[PDB]
Amino acid sequence: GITKASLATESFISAASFQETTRVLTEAAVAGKRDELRGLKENVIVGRLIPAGTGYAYHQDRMRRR
Amino acid sequence: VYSYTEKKRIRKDFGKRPQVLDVPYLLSIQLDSFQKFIEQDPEGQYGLEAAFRSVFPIQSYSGNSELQYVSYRLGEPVFDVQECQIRGVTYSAPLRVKLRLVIYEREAPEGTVKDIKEQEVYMGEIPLMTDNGTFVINGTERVIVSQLHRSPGVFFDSDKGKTHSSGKVLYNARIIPYRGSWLDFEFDPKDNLFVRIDRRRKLPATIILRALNYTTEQILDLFFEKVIFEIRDNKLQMELVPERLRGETASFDIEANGKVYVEKGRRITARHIRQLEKDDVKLIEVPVEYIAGKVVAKDYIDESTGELICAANMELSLDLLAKLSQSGHKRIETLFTNDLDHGPYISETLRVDPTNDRLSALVEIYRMMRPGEPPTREAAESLFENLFFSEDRYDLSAVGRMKFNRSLLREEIEGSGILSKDDIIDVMKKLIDIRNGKGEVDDIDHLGNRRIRSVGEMAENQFRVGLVRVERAVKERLSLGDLDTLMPQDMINAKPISAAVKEFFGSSQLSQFMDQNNPLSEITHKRRISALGPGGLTRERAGFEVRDVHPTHYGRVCPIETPEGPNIGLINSLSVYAQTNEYGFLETPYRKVTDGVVTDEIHYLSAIEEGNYVIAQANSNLDEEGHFVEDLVTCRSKGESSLFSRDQVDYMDVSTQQVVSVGASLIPFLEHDDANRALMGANMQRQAVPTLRADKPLVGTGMERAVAVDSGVTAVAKRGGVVQYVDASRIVIKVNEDEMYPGEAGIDIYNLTKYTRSNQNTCINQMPCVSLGEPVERGDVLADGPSTDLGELALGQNMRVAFMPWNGYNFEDSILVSERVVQEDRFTTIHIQELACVSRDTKLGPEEITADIPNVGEAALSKLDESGIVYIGAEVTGGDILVGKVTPKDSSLRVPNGVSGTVIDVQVFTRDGVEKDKRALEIEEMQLKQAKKDLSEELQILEAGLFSRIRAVLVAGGVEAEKLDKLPRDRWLELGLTDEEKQNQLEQLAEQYDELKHEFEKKLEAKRRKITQGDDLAPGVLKIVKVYLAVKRRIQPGDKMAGRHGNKGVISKINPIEDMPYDENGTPVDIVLNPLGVPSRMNIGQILETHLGMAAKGIGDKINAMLKQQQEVAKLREFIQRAYDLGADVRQKVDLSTFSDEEVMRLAENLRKGMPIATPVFDGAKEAEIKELLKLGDLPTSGQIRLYDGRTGEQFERPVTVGYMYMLKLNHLVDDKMHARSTGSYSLVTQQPLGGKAQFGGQRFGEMEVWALEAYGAAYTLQEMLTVKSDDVNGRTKMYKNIVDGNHQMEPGMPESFNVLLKEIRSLGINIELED
Amino acid sequence: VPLDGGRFATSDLNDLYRRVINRNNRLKRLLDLAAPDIIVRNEKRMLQEAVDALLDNGRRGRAITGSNKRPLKSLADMIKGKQGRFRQNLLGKRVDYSGRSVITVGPYLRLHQCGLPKKMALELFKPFIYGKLELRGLATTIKAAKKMVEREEAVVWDILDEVIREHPVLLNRAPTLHRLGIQAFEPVLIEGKAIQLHPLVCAAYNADFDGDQMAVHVPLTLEAQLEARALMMSTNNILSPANGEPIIVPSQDVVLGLYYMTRDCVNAKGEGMVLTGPKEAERLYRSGLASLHARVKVRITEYEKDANGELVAKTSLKDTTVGRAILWMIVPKGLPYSIVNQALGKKAISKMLNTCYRILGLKPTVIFADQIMYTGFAYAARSGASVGIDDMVIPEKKHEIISEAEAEVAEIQEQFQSGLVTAGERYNKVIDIWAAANDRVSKAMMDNLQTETVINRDGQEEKQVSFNSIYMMADSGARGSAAQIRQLAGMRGLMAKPDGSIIETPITANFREGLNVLQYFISTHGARKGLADTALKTANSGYLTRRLVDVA
DNA sequence: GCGTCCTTCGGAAGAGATTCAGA
DNA sequence: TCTGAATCTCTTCCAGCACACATCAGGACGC
RNA sequence: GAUGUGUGCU
Ligand SMILES: [Mg+2]
């Protein structure tokens, strides 16, 4: 479902900011997950350009740079 | 006839059916409940007398001493209402209650006392209520809203459906006390009875059964009936009750007295039962295997050895019956556990019950209530006795006991406030019966199960808490007392009572800040029934049936007046005729109907007495005698209406207005509006701000006068007489000799309340509506309050509207307003607002208010005086200095930006200890002069009146008028008269004159002391200067205007006069609305109001034309009589032949602006009468006239609707909503811009607005939205420098709120970090 | 934060930290004095409870409260929930260079323009005014320019006009449901305090003018300005992102103007005349020699791009009206004449804009939308399309349909009480019969409304579609439908409770006659259902879109 | 006046703990 | 009498923006 | 800064 498919993503930041912050952060801390800042909510929270529109070219340049 | 407040402009009424009961006092709930709370009750039923007796007498821990109550007295308030509002202290009266401390003699529990001493100890201070139902708590006026909560008692709810996910409907019974703990019983999906105290956890109800000291045999005796098995020669026959064979299957061949009645496997119908009854038999044969499915009630012990064979509540079998046969117990008793009717719920509860006796049940109850502690016997017994069997920890009120004893169908309604064993037993029995099928649940939304807790009861409850805390302190202290030295004041602490009462009246969910921006707002705030608050339901845990309008709301709660938004249906409004029962329930008047006659005796029927009779409806025709003109009249019998005969009815509604509230009954043609539009119209009519000149509604309802008079804003005369002297600030009434008392007669002065600030920064200002030397009766208005016109609620202006599209300037909902409307200042409003400049003695030295301001020129200091404050009358604008305050190193009080004004008042409060400033001294001197002058002036006025009365008594019994004038007025009381009782009257009047002189002197001294007082303030403030501005907000494009039918609108253009459409007479149209707003939202009442206002203004135009050229009184009288005779069959019936040919000239002058029309709520005018009234003038009957274009000069090619609609001005002013913010002030924890308009704050670009920028793909815009003008700090200033550098480029960093998030995660045991 | 006086603010984290430190210090002291075992174990338990209350308060048995029985927020209550550092300060923030005011129409505008109040744009574009004041040399520092802007001198307004020229601002309404709730307009400075909003984008914003406010946001950087001009511009937002239908559709007044214009009645000031073009039709209408609803023959040159982008003219002589010929003067070249030669409603001109965009492009579509709005407002003003009380014509056979249905319901009651149907089927059959009766009454009143225009053909009587105002604004799709118009002159019908159940009894009166003291009470059930449904069940539809956005 | 201090009550859904039953 | 199915119990969620007002912030007891 | 109440548009 749209709740489980959003709470079970690979980025713990999106899941924590969506719902069940305590339960998401507990699992992330136990499992030692490492977020890659791949979505749009993650870059909004961090404070970067979203990899969606005019920032998509910049994010492609940054990804292929390294 | 008509009084002089009615024979000055008499409103034409279209009401067809007469009214047999006038509208009662509107704010009569607050005034009655607080009167019950505040007055002396010798019996002690309700009020403070019932709160002291509920606690006092208070004794020690059997320490041979007692403290007991005697009487209480309320002293005069320290300041009156006006002075309390000026200063800012609670309008309260000290509570002086006479206590009496008695300690007995030693070795004498009932003997004499060592001493008896008594004094009145000051404990607490209860705020008094004004004459309008408003409380002055901290200078601001508060209104304590009534509360609609569940009545105490027993309610059998359902919990139907969604539980257990199998469809099985459970059953629960809740015993709600007024004070105490709940006693929830409920059923199990396996049909068990679980009690639940305070909703903690389930355990079997048989635990409470044994806790009530009941044995299992007694329990089975209570909840079951016995069936007897007897030991005989053989076959072990059973006693038979033929009714027990109703609806089951015969397990074998039923026979009695030999012959077989019912064969094996047959059904036992009613015929078989009746035939067995006619057989008159009692005994039948029964196989031994049939008793295998039975349960023994009473335990059986051996007759030989005494050992128990079978205990109580256990199944039987063949071996058990064999062991019983050899014992010798000739009688066997079992339980009649029917499968459908007499379910064995108690037996299953006992089987699942783990406890065995009273002690173990008490232990289990104690473990449930207080876990984590080893239970002992005495503590558990004390707890269970304190739960529902003590008057101190549990109390069903009188209404609670009434509901409890009426729900269980008992006879007597009085009883003990505590629960008893019988009450619990009957509650469980009724729950079991409801489970069986006999009886039914009751709905919570029924108005017969919901009370009203008004101001008095709620205030009394908190006083009880304060007294409980005080008596707990006394209990702690009374055993440690040093006797013979304890006055009845050393143990009474006034802090708990005062703290509790202040906590209730100041900071509560029902001590609401009064919504006061017209009389309607306050009269509907006082008459508000809020389901929220303490003891009520929260907004989140509110179902969709509580919000809904119940059928029992008819006549008790308005259906159409409830606020939109989060709480709709929880804030119900009281009806016009609704009252409060002696217990608290709502009731409505009804005309009692005999066999065929509708009498005039009104009975107030509650919400539970209404469902028994069949009640007719208000719009049922009668013919001069109380007989229904038709055979079948539409009536509502039991929550469901249908046609009933004229003989079955026994009640009838008083009027069509009794279902709607006082706010929804001011909407003309309410029966034509959609009820959503009715709700919006009621709310907007509550929101209207009073304009500059009040203007009556041409189309009204007849309840405008009732709201105007009963709100309290109008100075209504107390005793009738002749206006002796009318000034712009006072009215003096020469009382008639008929109503003048023999002693202390004098006259009465009405001091009007001039321009002053209300709660919503509006201007409430009374002005006289009477003339000099004009006769006034009792209870007629003298001064029109805010938005009042000759004692008639006038919240707006009669606007000449046209419904037509005009070049898109009324596109969606906008209004196009002519320039003449703003030229005439029709919608111009006064907005008096105050500004405070507190001077707090901070560190580095205190502050000052000196007139020299550093780094500021003399341009801003020109308006300031030498003392630093601004002159009264200065036309200050935004940004000017009002009070020049300097902190120890400039923080002077400035006018907020964007508002002009005019300083009309300056008040300086100085802490006692700061000497003074010369402006404070000037204000004090002027106030002293005014306070002496007013007292001297009132003494002179009612002393000239007293001397006039002395002369009027002197004329009887030998008067000499020639010597009276030349004699000085000092010696006028002992002049020529005999020694009869008239001389006694003269002596009494002389003594009254001397007493008035002395009272004036002493009150002058008191006023001098009060003005020269200290007026202590908050800790750490030196002096406060409150400057009152007075803005005149003219109308402008942007501010909301609305009608009375929920047709809102924001003005889009102030069009010139020559551009507005005009008719063939050249008259411009003031307002052009949009036609398409009418069909979509079915507010057709605005079109009918437009047509009726057109007719009213046509009548007014005809009167004005007949009056402009001076015609004889005959023609005016003829035409006005024609206008007042129009109608089918009206109740008005006004004859102008009784007018004195000059009272009709005043009427004609008042009608030249347009004849006011009364159009009752559901008994209004019809279209035939509207068309006939249009015919009475010269206007077309269709309501539509020909309008030509204002600018192009060519006609609109269709007739358009033109008429006078009563437009309001809602106080959603555009200049109070416009806001802008560049780089300004930021928050503290997260470096974000602040939020709000009072604070300089930026609009929130919320979560839903970020998805809108993500959808476009705007990534740079979003990035600058959340970093550069947001949480980020260094980039925020770099961007500002770039913007003022000619370069629009950003260098964003990281938002500060993300670092806050990282630190807050790290503050837990979680380690979050950014990798490289 | 120090308040007024010597007191301090009531912080929750500080209170929790003080409790934890008190318990920890007490345990540390008891661990050195060798306290009895029960006391030290109880103190350790209290320390555990204090730490649990500090980390996540309320997850244990009872949440500790600070004052007057309210649970103080722990280190988790300020990171989770709707009021935490995730949904309140990171996914959406407060912004500088922002404003807020009510909105008015101002229909003189264009699709790329809005009206900023003159005193609001001065406070929004304040650093931009500072920059140009320092550039032009009227000020030497930032404080001199700040004081000059504060004083609002005569030169500041010219600087504001220069800096506001091509700097688009973002107008956002409070519920930003879809992406068309944020759009960029080129400001047009106005005197006032209300933000004039173009009437075409009101459908996209879902913004009427009855007291609602919109927020202004100023794009700062060059990239932000170009994103507002190329992506968020209201000119580039003429199609809904959900479906390809146009979203800047004329609504409720322009459609009424275009429906009164493009219409015909069988008579005129001049009907048999034949014209030489649309200019002749406009000249005849303005001079008053021909009604707007004539049936004349105009000679019209329509273009067509059936070739590879070449507009080939084809002049003919078509049977049109004067109003349609006048409207043809604004239709851009390339569109067939068989789109205005009919009675234009709302769907018709929505289709006209859609085909204009699909054939011609974006710029002709925007210019066409502006011209359509102008000529709809003008010819709706020039008609006086009012609404009276005689326009809601009651049918003369409604009570016969009422009597038939009440007889049917009486027969249903007699069948139910006998035992033919249960109490769950009587409900359904009575709802069905009353809904059929309501539809029959609606059909009767609609037939009595739509065609009730008996007018001579200059000879004998003839029938035509009615010019009744209620029917005009119902058929044109301006504002209304069969339901709302039916409730005015037909019968209101039967209501629905908040739970969803339909009322057993129907209302047999309309909003032109009165309503009973009881029929209004019955209607209040549905009226309160309608108002409770929004405020209490749009939460579980905003939740749906929130957890749809957060999953995709 | 300063000043140190130690109630209960919605409601649908989902997950994870018991607990049943049934072969 | 072991293991899926059912039931019980605990948990988390319940739209957006904005405006106005008041009240709190330790209050008890020692000094 | 948080609560409590009222309110505006959806
Ligand atoms: Mg709106």
Short mmCIF file of C-alpha atoms in Angstrom, two decimals, chain B residues 849-852 861-871 882 917-920 922:
data_model
loop_
_atom_site.label_atom_id
_atom_site.label_comp_id
_atom_site.label_asym_id
_atom_site.label_seq_id
_atom_site.Cartn_x
_atom_site.Cartn_y
_atom_site.Cartn_z
CA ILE B 849 9.47 58.85 30.01
CA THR B 850 11.31 62.12 29.43
CA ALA B 851 10.60 64.23 26.35
CA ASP B 852 14.19 64.34 25.01
CA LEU B 861 9.00 65.59 19.36
CA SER B 862 6.80 68.56 18.39
CA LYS B 863 3.57 66.78 19.37
CA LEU B 864 5.01 65.63 22.70
CA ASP B 865 4.58 67.83 25.76
CA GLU B 866 7.30 68.71 28.26
CA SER B 867 6.48 65.49 30.15
CA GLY B 868 6.99 63.20 27.14
CA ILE B 869 3.37 62.18 26.52
CA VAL B 870 1.35 63.23 23.47
CA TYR B 871 -1.37 65.88 23.68
CA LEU B 882 3.29 59.02 21.44
CA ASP B 917 5.19 63.29 36.48
CA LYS B 918 3.65 66.64 35.63
CA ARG B 919 1.39 65.14 32.97
CA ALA B 920 0.15 62.57 35.49
CA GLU B 922 -2.39 67.41 35.26
#
